Amino acid sequence: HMPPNRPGITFEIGARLEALDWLQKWWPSRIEKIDYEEGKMLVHFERWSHRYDEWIYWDSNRLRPLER
């Protein structure tokens, strides 16, 4: 699959964005891996240890552009 066109987000390893974490708080986050077969990404929530890294489908509303 090809990643969707979401303005302000680059679907690339190492790209930063904002993601809603396990406490429902928005904070900067970083893409760790992309699974193009299932259309999901491994997201690192920067306010959290990598034990909290989570696979998120790339259409999820838990992702939004990084605050400018």
Instruction: Spell out the domain ranges in the chain.
Output: 1-68
Q: Could you write out the three-class secondary structure of 24-64?
A: CCEEEEEEEEEECCCCEEEEEECCCCHHHCEEEECCCCCEE
d(CA 32, CA 41): 7
Resolution in A: 1.8
Kindly give, in sequence order, each residue whose CB lies less than 8 Å from that of residue 53, ignoring residues fewer than 6 positions away.
32, 42, 43, 44, 45
- The technique is X-ray
* Collapsed DSSP state (helix, strand, coil) of residue 18: strand
Length of the chain, please?
68
Using alpha carbons only, give the angle 21, 26, 30 rounded to the nearest 5 degrees. Answer: 70
